[PDB]
């Protein structure tokens, strides 16, 4: 008998819609992939419900209610979920190859530096840094994993042809990178990074990812005071 599973996530600008938060998306995605029956409740952090205040006094977001147990810390929540929702009833989502768990994880810090910088003399250095991080990801994607034995992998995702926890982490981060770089830097992931573009097409084709993305407009609004014009 499945204990009740309810994920509390960041609300967006109207207090109700999906807010910008790659951690909330990461977990919505894990739960979707597990096949478990769950609920998702958005939280307006300036206008919290009484239930939320009692469930999670610390105020952290996302958090999970599992039966009457609360869990904070996205990574720990992810671990918990991978362990308790397990086969036979639910699929193991962990990657087979440990480097799937790290591939592309530096892109986000590179992106953050790029968009926060206002020193024009430093802008091309930061762009190059983000580009090199994307290219290390493009290389991981196009390199055949063991389970595949031209030399260009055609697997759909980071670890193989199925979505794993690893994609649930990276895909929400890459999404923000795309939307915010287009809007504030006029920067686009070069078409020549074909592994990265095949991955994203595959990902946007899957509802687990598409359906759990905040709107562009919300991501853009979230970065409005943080993205700096060069001066």
UniProtKB/Swiss-Prot annotation:
CDD domains, alphabetized: GST_C_CLIC1 (cd10300), GST_N_CLIC (cd03061)
Superkingdom in the source lineage: Eukaryota
Residue numbers carrying N6-acetyllysine: 10, 116, 128
Impact reported for residue 56 to A: Loss of glutathione-dependent oxidoreductase activity
Gene3D superfamilies noted in UniProt: 1.20.1050.10, Glutaredoxin (3.40.30.10)
Disulfide bonds: 21-56
Enzyme class: oxidoreductase
Residues that hold glutathione according to the record: 21, 61, 74
Catalysed reactions, as listed in the record: L-dehydroascorbate + 2 glutathione = glutathione disulfide + L-ascorbate; chloride(in) = chloride(out); iodide(out) = iodide(in); thiocyanate(in) = thiocyanate(out)
Motif (G-site): 21-24
Tissue: Expression is prominent in heart, placenta, liver, kidney and pancreas.
GO terms, biological process: chloride transport; platelet aggregation; positive regulation of osteoblast differentiation; regulation of mitochondrial membrane potential; signal transduction
Subcellular location: Nucleus; Nucleus membrane; Cytoplasm; Cell membrane
One GO molecular-function entry: chloride channel activity
Record note on modification: Hydrogen peroxide treatment causes a conformation change, leading to dimerization and formation of an intramolecular disulfide bond between Cys-21 and Cys-56.
Modified residues (Phosphotyrosine): 223
GO cellular component: blood microparticle; brush border; chloride channel complex; cytoplasm; endoplasmic reticulum; extracellular exosome; extracellular space; membrane
Entry's family note: Belongs to the chloride channel CLIC family.
Domain note: The active G-site contains a monothiol Cys-X-X-Ser motif which mediates glutathione-dependent redox catalysis.
Note: The protein seems to have very low affinity for glutathione, even though glutathione binding was observed in protein crystals.
Subunit architecture: Monomer. Homodimer (in vitro). Interacts with TRAPPC2. Dimerization requires a conformation change that leads to the exposure of a large hydrophobic surface. In vivo, this may lead to membrane insertion. Interacts with AKAP9.
Protein name (database record): Chloride intracellular channel protein 1
GN (gene name): CLIC1
